[PDB]
Every structure is written in structure tokens, then in C-alpha cells.
Amino acid sequence: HTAHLRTARLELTPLDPAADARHLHHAYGDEEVMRWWTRPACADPAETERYLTSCAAAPGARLWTIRAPDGTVPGMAGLLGGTDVPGLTWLLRRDSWGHGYATEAAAAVVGHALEDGGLDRVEAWIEAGNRRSLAVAARVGLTERARLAQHYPHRPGPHEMVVLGKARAEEPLTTLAVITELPVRDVAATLRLVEAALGARTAFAIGDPPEFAEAALTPWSAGPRFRLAAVPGPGPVEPVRLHLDAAGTADSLHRRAVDAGARVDGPPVRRPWGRSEFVITLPEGHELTVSAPV
Amino acid sequence: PRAHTAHLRTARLELTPLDPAADARHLHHAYGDEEVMRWWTRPACADPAETERYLTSCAAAPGARLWTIRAPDGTVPGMAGLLGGTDVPGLTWLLRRDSWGHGYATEAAAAVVGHALEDGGLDRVEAWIEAGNRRSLAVAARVGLTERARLAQHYPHRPGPHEMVVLGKARAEEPLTTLAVITELPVRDVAATLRLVEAALGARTAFAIGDPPEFAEAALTPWSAGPRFRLAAVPGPGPVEPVRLHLDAAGTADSLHRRAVDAGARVDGPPVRRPWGRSEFVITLPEGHELTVSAPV
Incomplete structure (x- = not known):
């Protein structure tokens, strides 16, 4: 993909693991920020570079790097993949938190996915306990559809994963x-x-x-x-x-x-x-x- | 049912056991509001009399435990309580458009729940909100209620059916569930x-x-x-x-x-x-x- 997504105060540029890994490591290597991630905080930007790549590598992967006007790079947002239904995700260094970035970024990715992305629907898997993320998801029109039990290798006990979604045209019939x-x-x-x-x-x-x-x-x-x-x-x-x-x-x-x-x-x-x-x-x-x- | 007696007091509010006749005039600002009642189980009340009536039927309801929300400036934002006639402690609240966005509904519902789960010794409490009720679900979440199921319903006063999200919260969550x-x-x-x-x-x-x-x-x-x-x-x-x-x-x-x-x-x-x-x-x-x-x- 080549498309950049622009918003009130943001520019989402396609993700380049090599180039961006330096900044993005400020999030992926932060113990705190990854409190909810599927795997612990990345050791080195190489790992991040590696992860980012393995991430963008997957089939429908389509990610961007959140770029603000004031030079900063709060983090990234985009569509994950290898999956069936286009998953969605985002992440920001602890600093850029609560500045509406996540919401703005999330809003952008979503809009694009349904509209110009030509997609029919989009999911987003957020851990049950993840209040903040769940707020953004809801704030973006992603309503909860299902839930499932899961376990992360680094976790002491299992957990619940919420599966939110949002189609372009909400089917009238459903089970x-x-x-x-x-x-x-x-x-x-x-x-x-x-x-x-x-x-x-x-x-x-x-x-x-x-x-x-x-x-x-x-x-x-x-x-x-x-x-x-x-x-x-x-x-x-x-x-x-x-x-x-x-x-x-x-x-x-x-x-x-x-x-x-x-x-x-x-x-x-x-x-x-x-x-x-x-x-x-x-x-x-x-x-x-x-x-x-x- | 019976008594009550309890008065729920929060940061900027006072919850007084609802008194139909007494409050109805004020609460009619909510129940009589077409907009505010677009998500409710019945149409808006034609007038306060109808509101007093409704409030009464609701108040009389089996274990109904409702309160009226009193603001420090003397305003009555709306009501909030525990519905009677269920199997699982139901839950409701309603504000007038003029009191929207002050976090009143969150504060109020928070108090009703804290009371029910701690003081009321209740086990768990639900809350049925229509799928599209963005603000109510937002309050639900902000309060601690999490979706547990969804049902299809249809109100006679509506042309088409709708979806209802069943959110809830217990005092001690079960490790195992299905x-x-x-x-x-x-x-x-x-x-x-x-x-x-x-x-x-x-x-x-x-x-x-x-x-x-x-x-x-x-x-x-x-x-x-x-x-x-x-x-x-x-x-x-x-x-x-x-x-x-x-x-x-x-x-x-x-x-x-x-x-x-x-x-x-x-x-x-x-x-x-x-x-x-x-x-x-x-x-x-x-x-x-x-x-x-x-x-x-």
C-alpha cells in the first residue's frame, strides 16, 4: 500500500520496519505499554524491526506509523492479519497517551478500511480488562460481537478477549x-x-x-x-x-x-x-x- | 419490596427514594421527552400526570427500588434505581437532555450499583440497554457493567424490532464460566x-x-x-x-x-x-x- 491517511492533527504513513523501528521501539520495548500485548516488551529494535516486518509481512497486513506535526512519532495503527476478518490495532508510547491520538488514528484506519479500503467489515480484538482500548473501540463505532478465552505464554493465567466489529452496511438479519x-x-x-x-x-x-x-x-x-x-x-x-x-x-x-x-x-x-x-x-x-x- | 429508607449520597449528588406525586413534575422533563425516550420501553408520557402514573406503577413494581437524583443547585437531573419484577436484579436510570454530559448518570448508576452489590448484599445486577444507545452503554462501561449477552426484542409502539445488550456485574466474579x-x-x-x-x-x-x-x-x-x-x-x-x-x-x-x-x-x-x-x-x-x-x- 502507498496511501497516507491524514487527520485533524495526524499523518499515517505506510510502515517501514527499518526506518520507523527506531521510534516505534519506544513503545514496543516499553514494559508498561505492552502490559496488554500478546508477547512481552521487545528487547531490541532489531526484534521490533523483526516483529514489525513479520507483522506487515502477513497477507492482508496494512499498517501505518502515526506522525504528528510536532515531529513526534506517537506510535502506529493499522490492520493486522493473516487472519480471515481484517483485525485492527494500534499502539502509542506512554507519552502520547490521552491526546486523542489513538482515537484519531483508530478513527482514520477504520474509516479508510470501510470506505476506500473497499472492505466489508473490520474487527478488533481487545482484552476484556483493557478499558482504555475498549473505550476507543467503542468511540470508533466498533461494537462488541463475541468473546473468547485465551492464554498468552507469558501470562500466569488465561484471559478473555473481546471481539468488536463494525461493518460498512449492518446486515438486517443475524443470529x-x-x-x-x-x-x-x-x-x-x-x-x-x-x-x-x-x-x-x-x-x-x-x-x-x-x-x-x-x-x-x-x-x-x-x-x-x-x-x-x-x-x-x-x-x-x-x-x-x-x-x-x-x-x-x-x-x-x-x-x-x-x-x-x-x-x-x-x-x-x-x-x-x-x-x-x-x-x-x-x-x-x-x-x-x-x-x-x- | 417494602420500605427502603436509604438515601444514596455521592460526590455531587443526593439520591432520594423516588416519590411519584412529589417528583413527577421534575422527572417529566425526562419521561415526557420524545428524544430522551427514544430508547425506552414505552413512548413518552403525554403529561406529568401520565409520568406520575408511570412512576407509580414502576414504584409499586415488586422489588422496585428507585431514587430521584438531586443536584446541589437543586436540579433534578433524573432518576436511577433497581427495577422490580425480574429474576436478576435489573437496573435503570434516565436523565433529561439538559443534564446530559455532566457525568451525572455515571455517578448515579455507580452509587446504585455500589449499594446493591455491597450494602444490598446482592450477588449481581444486570442492565438492559438497546444496541444503539451509545451514551447509555458508555455509562454502563464507565460504571463497570460488561456485556454478557444480546437479545432481539420488539416494542408494540415501534414499527420494527431491535437489539438489546444485556450488561452485568457481580460482587465476586466466577473464575470459571462458559x-x-x-x-x-x-x-x-x-x-x-x-x-x-x-x-x-x-x-x-x-x-x-x-x-x-x-x-x-x-x-x-x-x-x-x-x-x-x-x-x-x-x-x-x-x-x-x-x-x-x-x-x-x-x-x-x-x-x-x-x-x-x-x-x-x-x-x-x-x-x-x-x-x-x-x-x-x-x-x-x-x-x-x-x-x-x-x-x-
Whole structure:
């Protein structure tokens, strides 16, 4: 890309790892600034130069370097990549903070991505705890669409990643959730189980003994939850396979399932796709593999 | 319900247990404001009398715990409290356009929540804000509430449906939680299946394994994460015990149905309005699986 993006007080020039690495290292090498980054603070500008390159290297990578009028170089902003949906990001040395740069820069990149970038939509992955960044994202029209558990090699424990987005034309139709029904013998008994293993809870039930309930896996009005329908028998019951994306550690999740007398597959096992999973099987045959970031 | 008695005092505000008759005159500046009420669950009140009435019905509501916001200069910016009649401590607030931008709503809601979670001994509290309510969501965040889910709703006083973000906050967050449930739909031709799915459901395949689709993942959203299920391939006799999938969609069912139909899908018929204020239809998969599609309207 050749395009420069100009704003009230800024010029975003295409990113040159070699040339810019000197200034950009004032952010990428700062322990503080990288408090939220996917990897610790860069050691040397070479590493930065290296990273920056590996970064701009990826397929759809399209980054700029934030240049202010007063000579300074607060940092950078742009579209990350190698991914499917164009991710977005930014970073500034601690100094340039709160001067509206991030907001301005972010606003620029976004505008361009949707408009002249010819793109249909744009994402932005911000850590849950990242208030400041979440403010900018929202300030830029990026509304939250999903969330996911993740773990950084340098982190003591896993974390939550918010996935904000913003299309050019907001689709009129969309799916907000998928609730799957589960045929079980004793809806009640099952509810009791799930409530303990997955720390679930009953959202509702129809008649006593219960004949049809809605098991919620979160203590909130809406969210991850599935229906429980009752069935007579004789009992063949065709199993249902369920993938459970959980937050927190697989060992403590598994510890909970077991300590709840759950039919567990075994201890959690790591996987190529970077997720430690373990399964739970319900008497009727259904099995739900619980998968955590770690 | 009952008493209250409590008065919430903050940096520049005083929260006094709402008194319909008393305050209504002032609060009508909010509830009677078309602009201010464009995001509310009902139209603006024609006059203070209607506001007093509404305020009363709200005040009477089961465990309703509301306060009126008093500014030091004697102004009444609006109201803020805890709604009654829920299952999870609901939460609301409302300012008049004239008091906007002073951080009153943040200060107020902050206090109601601090009270509810600490003094009220409450476990958690929610807050339902319409997707497009930029300022309210901003206050939500500034207060500590974080989105936990989203629902499709439709107010009789509106021509079209809308989205509602369900934000919340507990006093002691749970280490373990669940983010999603992706179920496996055993089908014969994972390929065609996916082709169809994207047609009617407007899905898009996130990933496919093996040239001949051995097992893919159809996302129902255009984003990295969000609602979606998994397709597994399996050949056989009379192949499968249909899997039941409830699909909560946003937008008018009439058109959702139009999509499923133009996609040439198996639909048990046009959308049928249910009693619980929801219209739906079901799409059956050749294998057996029924994917009912519910919408607010």
C-alpha cells in the first residue's frame, strides 16, 4: 500500500520496519505499554524491526506509523492479519497517551478500511480488562460481537478477549444464539448434575416432575444455555456431541466436573489447535467436550 | 419490596427514594421527552400526570427500588434505581437532555450499583440497554457493567424490532464460566449442508477439514466468534436421530423465512406468532435435524 491517511492533527504513513523501528521501539520495548500485548516488551529494535516486518509481512497486513506535526512519532495503527476478518490495532508510547491520538488514528484506519479500503467489515480484538482500548473501540463505532478465552505464554493465567466489529452496511438479519435441545430421561436429575459439574443453573422447567427445562451455563438472563427435553424410552437414545468453550483453566473445570460425580473422559489433554480438552458423558449417551484455553 | 429508607449520597449528588406525586413534575422533563425516550420501553408520557402514573406503577413494581437524583443547585437531573419484577436484579436510570454530559448518570448508576452489590448484599445486577444507545452503554462501561449477552426484542409502539445488550456485574466474579456451545450436526454431505446453511441462514463456513468435507464448522455470524455449529460426516441407512436446534435470530421472521425459502430449504410453513411474543418457523434437515428460527417479530 502507498496511501497516507491524514487527520485533524495526524499523518499515517505506510510502515517501514527499518526506518520507523527506531521510534516505534519506544513503545514496543516499553514494559508498561505492552502490559496488554500478546508477547512481552521487545528487547531490541532489531526484534521490533523483526516483529514489525513479520507483522506487515502477513497477507492482508496494512499498517501505518502515526506522525504528528510536532515531529513526534506517537506510535502506529493499522490492520493486522493473516487472519480471515481484517483485525485492527494500534499502539502509542506512554507519552502520547490521552491526546486523542489513538482515537484519531483508530478513527482514520477504520474509516479508510470501510470506505476506500473497499472492505466489508473490520474487527478488533481487545482484552476484556483493557478499558482504555475498549473505550476507543467503542468511540470508533466498533461494537462488541463475541468473546473468547485465551492464554498468552507469558501470562500466569488465561484471559478473555473481546471481539468488536463494525461493518460498512449492518446486515438486517443475524443470529444471536443457538440453543440446542437435549433428550434426557430425568430432566430433573440432569439439571442437578449440570448445575454442579458445569456450575449451571435452571432457567426454567415445565411441570413436576420436570418435563422440559432450559439449562443456563451463566448466571445471566441470556447466554450459553441449552434445553432439556424428557423422553420415555425403552432407552436406545442417540448421543449428541457438544463443544463447550469455557473460560478459566481446564484442570479446575475438570476438577469441578469430577468433584460433581460427572462421567469424565479423563484428565484434560492438550491439542494441536492449542486447547486442553476433556469430555463429559451423560447416561443417555451424549458427550460434551469441555475446552479451555489452558 | 417494602420500605427502603436509604438515601444514596455521592460526590455531587443526593439520591432520594423516588416519590411519584412529589417528583413527577421534575422527572417529566425526562419521561415526557420524545428524544430522551427514544430508547425506552414505552413512548413518552403525554403529561406529568401520565409520568406520575408511570412512576407509580414502576414504584409499586415488586422489588422496585428507585431514587430521584438531586443536584446541589437543586436540579433534578433524573432518576436511577433497581427495577422490580425480574429474576436478576435489573437496573435503570434516565436523565433529561439538559443534564446530559455532566457525568451525572455515571455517578448515579455507580452509587446504585455500589449499594446493591455491597450494602444490598446482592450477588449481581444486570442492565438492559438497546444496541444503539451509545451514551447509555458508555455509562454502563464507565460504571463497570460488561456485556454478557444480546437479545432481539420488539416494542408494540415501534414499527420494527431491535437489539438489546444485556450488561452485568457481580460482587465476586466466577473464575470459571462458559462462552459458547457449539453442537455437532451429523450429516451425510458436509459440503451441500454447508452450501444450504449459508443460503438460508446466511452462514459462512469458518473451516473445513479434508477435501471431501469430513468435518466443517459453519459460523452463523460474519465474525471470528459468535453463534455457530459443527457438521460431522457420516454415511448410513436411515442415518440420524434429528437434532433439535433453537435459533434466536434478530430481524423480522417474515424475511428470515423468505431467505430460508429462497434458499430452497425445508420449512414447516410460514412464521407463526407464538404466545410468548415470538414468531418462528422450523427448517428440517434431510437427515432429520430441525432448526426452529425464532424472532421477536
